[PDB]
Design a protein around this ligand. Sequence first.
Ligand SMILES: [Ca+2]
Ligand SMILES: [Ca+2]
Ligand SMILES: [Cl-]
Ligand SMILES: [Cl-]
Ligand SMILES: [Cl-]
Ligand SMILES: [Cl-]
Ligand SMILES: [Cl-]
Ligand SMILES: [Cl-]
Ligand SMILES: [K+]
Ligand SMILES: [K+]
Ligand SMILES: [K+]
Ligand SMILES: [K+]
Ligand SMILES: [K+]
Ligand SMILES: [K+]
Lengths: 222, 222, 223, 224, 223, 224
Amino acid sequence: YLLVKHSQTDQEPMCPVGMNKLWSGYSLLYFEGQEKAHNQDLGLAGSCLARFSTMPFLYCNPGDVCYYASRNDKSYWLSTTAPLPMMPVAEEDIRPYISRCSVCEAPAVAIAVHSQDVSIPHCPAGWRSLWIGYSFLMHTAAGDEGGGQSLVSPGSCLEDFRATPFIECNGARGTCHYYANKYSFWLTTIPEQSFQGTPSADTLKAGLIRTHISRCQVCMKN
Amino acid sequence: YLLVKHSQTDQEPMCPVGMNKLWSGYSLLYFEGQEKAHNQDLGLAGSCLARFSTMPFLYCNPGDVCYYASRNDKSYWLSTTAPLPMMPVAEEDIRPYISRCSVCEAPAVAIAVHSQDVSIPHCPAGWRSLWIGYSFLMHTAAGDEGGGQSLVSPGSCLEDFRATPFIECNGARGTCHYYANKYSFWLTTIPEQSFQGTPSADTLKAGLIRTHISRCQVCMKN
Amino acid sequence: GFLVTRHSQTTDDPQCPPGTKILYHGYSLLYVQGNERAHGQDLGTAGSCLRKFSTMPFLFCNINNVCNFASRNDYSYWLSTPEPMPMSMAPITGENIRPFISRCAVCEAPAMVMAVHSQTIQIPQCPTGWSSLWIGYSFVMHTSAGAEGSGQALASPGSCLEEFRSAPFIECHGRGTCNYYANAYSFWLATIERSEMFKKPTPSTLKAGELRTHVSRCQVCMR
Amino acid sequence: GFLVTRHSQTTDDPQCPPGTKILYHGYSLLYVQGNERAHGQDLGTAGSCLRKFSTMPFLFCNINNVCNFASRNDYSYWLSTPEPMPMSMAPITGENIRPFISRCAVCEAPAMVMAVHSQTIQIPQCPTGWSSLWIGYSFVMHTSAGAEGSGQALASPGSCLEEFRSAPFIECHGRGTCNYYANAYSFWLATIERSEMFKKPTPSTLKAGELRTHVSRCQVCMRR
Amino acid sequence: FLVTRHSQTTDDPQCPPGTKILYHGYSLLYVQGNERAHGQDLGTAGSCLRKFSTMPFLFCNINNVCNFASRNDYSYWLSTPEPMPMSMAPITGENIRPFISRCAVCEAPAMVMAVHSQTIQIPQCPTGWSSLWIGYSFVMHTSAGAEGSGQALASPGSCLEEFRSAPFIECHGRGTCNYYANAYSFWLATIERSEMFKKPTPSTLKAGELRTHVSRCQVCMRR
Amino acid sequence: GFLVTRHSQTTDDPQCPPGTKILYHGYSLLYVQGNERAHGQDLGTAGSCLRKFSTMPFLFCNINNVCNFASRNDYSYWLSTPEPMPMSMAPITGENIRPFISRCAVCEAPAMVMAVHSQTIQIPQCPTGWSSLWIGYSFVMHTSAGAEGSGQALASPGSCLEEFRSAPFIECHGRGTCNYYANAYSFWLATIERSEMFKKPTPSTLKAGELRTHVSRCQVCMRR
Ligand SMILES: [Ca+2]
Ligand SMILES: [Ca+2]
Ligand SMILES: [Cl-]
Ligand SMILES: [Cl-]
Ligand SMILES: [Cl-]
Ligand SMILES: [Cl-]
Ligand SMILES: [Cl-]
Ligand SMILES: [Cl-]
Ligand SMILES: [K+]
Ligand SMILES: [K+]
Ligand SMILES: [K+]
Ligand SMILES: [K+]
Ligand SMILES: [K+]
Ligand SMILES: [K+]
């Protein structure tokens, strides 16, 4: 069993004591090839790439021709709290913006539970808590491409709420940046005990956001 | 022949002297039905709708059933300088935000010419100027839906440059608002005289933008 | 050399409006879809009137100098007739397709032609100085497979269909089949009361017999 | 600790299959659509079972650090019940939506659970050493608004619905409206005879009475 | 009334007899911004730009900040017979010039339209109209992300004088251009009378067998 | 019970890796496309291994209780073999399709399986305590008609194809045809030099005989 953790900072996460670390890397959210997004589950090892690059993949056509960083593709990564830049950051300046991750050998499977409430949900009886966070559901950026997380996957539970939890890297350009069309989607907190038939529209500004975001816990049996 | 003018204000535009006004209305950019945009050429009379509504259309299926404002469709309109609200504006409050237009009967066809330079382009010899503006090429908003203008059409030449020249109205909600994924695209002012095989990336902040937007002129023969 | 295209929405050739002369008659092409991308032809233009019909009126070529005709999974869409959908509800093929395809006429007019919309259930008057060619319903856009589609310019005669139909077009495929599908949607300009322009829309679900109660009317006119 | 998710496809809470213990019950979430992007929760995973229902169970936040809730035109899709489609065919709202939403159960299992498909009207046998939890129909994918949608992993129990429904889900909007629309399509694995495998598929259009008979069958099994 | 002509070569095309020259430029097919394609009908002056650029546009956001050539957008231009690089690698800077088609925007005394035969036969101009040029029926195209645009069949833009399996080249804000394997050009097919309501016969055509299976057209002007 | 799926990428049934037992063999399903939307099956899961082949393995139903099989314009995509594209370059049909379809094997393993990628032309070692099942090339996603497609989870055995192919899959249609198209793209993890991680990528155009120079390698392993 593998436990994947994303620090959301430029420092690799520590594997819980006792769990062997297979490797550390960079937090990969998704690739965009031919304007088609292909995501990696943040709770699976595939989302922790050992080597970073603004263009970590290439493509080939049936005519036996492959192109690397020779078109207009891009990649997306979970980011840190580094300040929003006035212009794209290039090469070495990208480093402080990319989230780090660690893949650890676990004794049992880890799952995420969500309360859809301001309260923290309980881990199932017989399961221990690994961390607490916010319910990260999906995202979109360039065009209408993007992706989402599995709610039972630890990848849907980010310890740090971020209105913009990821950054865009423009492949061949070798730069990353934050564009205005980036959206993060989170499960909401619901007042009702179990049924809400008519949502009340609302706009939340910095400071009064976190109290409206569903909470989660990542748990492991025993 | 018809000349269409969009005021980009909440006051209907005046038809050039000598030209009778067939009607005035609201500046329609596009409809979005089933997440598919259908645009109206801003230089054509179809972009000037006599009656406004956040949901100006309905749809039907082969089962002889039609639905009006009963799903999740929307409409987009050219907007005014009314300040970006921090939350959607509803019903009567929408009025100040919608651009007005006038459809005028003209002696000849009107065209737009673009310089792709900071220099305002001259009208062809034998043609007179109706107005000068900025090269408005295309736009996108929800998802990757949007559209664009015909560069020879007067609709591609707006007198007033706006980072966000249009507003989104959410159909059945009866509200309109400015969302962060709205984008306007304009032809650039190219430094080279006629061939730019290597663009130099740049980020422009408010105040240094207009001098970087291609200029245009709307002309009519005689 | 002004031109106006008219669609009968039946298997019979439509007649050129008074004052106009016939150029040719054909079949009503709405749009095509290749490599999953839709591209339409404004119904008010000659491009929507093809003399020869085929469920596959186009082909595609690649950079390797190879062209393929009816060799992938593409579509063609045509305005249809009142012909009811087969009882079997299964795709139609060959000569059995003919009863479903609308006919059109491309006519040359002495002057400019346009369409006007009332956005009410009443027929809008032609602007002063313009004469009538025909009246109809405000047709603005449509979608089908993959929610792809196209639409009409609101000042184009193409945005004014003389016959209202909940299903005004049929879908055909390169393999030679055509049929109506539940997701074939037709979008029409709706009626708007002046007092409700800046009021939250009142939802309405209309069934057979009451469908036209919210459909805007139009008139095609010539200077 | 392995998990199994079950959907009643009715207003009643489904029971955990034999050999598994309940964790929690909820409502059957099929997928959501935000900013025109569809994102599903595999029906075989706990993510497709939410403790609380809402026509808009999520919100979005922008780079200016402003979040908007139920203010635009987003969707939520849920597995539905046998509840009759309203005669008016008009959108359902508020408390009236409850009778239409399917319930689910997330249970803890002693071993792994997967689905197997026969691609015939016959029930597929569970591998040797595996026991049956339930039988159903092979549900593959679906589309609704904007032809957007999602699907199931064929190895997942989510691809094996216990009750075949031509319309297994309902569409809801942030406005608080839900309804069945004509473009709601459900995709299921088809039945294939050995001799039909490498022959041009024979087109067929089936109506009420002959639907379940051309749909692949499946069985959900546990390695125990 | 204007008429736009594309040489499909590096030399400026000449205005057809009866028309007057306004300006020359480069042949723009379409652009793609934030994953959305937007074309300029080839029959209109909008498809003829005075200045060439791999990224002739920029975008601005709601925070009033505009970004130029900083993301991953595209521009597409009609190309010339210039051989594709043997390396098949992207073309940059001044090396791009040889591949870009030139155009002419001319003023005409009457409107101009295109007619299509849907056969190998060249379609005659309607009575009362004179010929400007003949070509092949060009309908639509797709490239990056399967996005693209098309031509109005009534427009001269749907009638290319030189048939090209690969009529356009793709460029990026990076300052690179190239022909990619997914670049598809769609043309009207030839249809025999007895084939109209019959299942289309699939066919794959190779070099030397293409031009004769593409519908022909003729651009005419009322005169 | 853990499972691992293997694809031969040839007309022969692949054999289960050492330490695993066979459950069944079938055809390699990559993804399907219905109503213009793609939905894939991870190549490392049993869902990508179907016992019965057909150019149209699914059907769709509407809210009017009518189902349609091979009656619109849908697709199915399968991993292919090295069978060369026909000389005519025209679509393949019927029995002639079989030689082009890859075979697969679903195997039961005693412990969990995963793939690791080197992001270099060198084969990555299995994590300490994990044994080898097979080696391959880093296959991550693909696109075809309409630029639609799907991909593989990078820790899934499905992201590790044993045979590199510029064209690893073939496209089939409900009408019964299959063929390769110029826009059928395969995406692979590329080789990244450590010193270049935070440097502008160096573009490369590779042709036959040099394709593999930038393709990352991988190894599928099992916990001991
Ligand atoms: Ca897209
Ligand atoms: Ca879209
Ligand atoms: Cl690239
Ligand atoms: Cl609506
Ligand atoms: Cl086809
Ligand atoms: Cl909403
Ligand atoms: Cl760019
Ligand atoms: Cl089909
Ligand atoms: K931006
Ligand atoms: K926003
Ligand atoms: K249908
Ligand atoms: K409907
Ligand atoms: K390529
Ligand atoms: K091809």
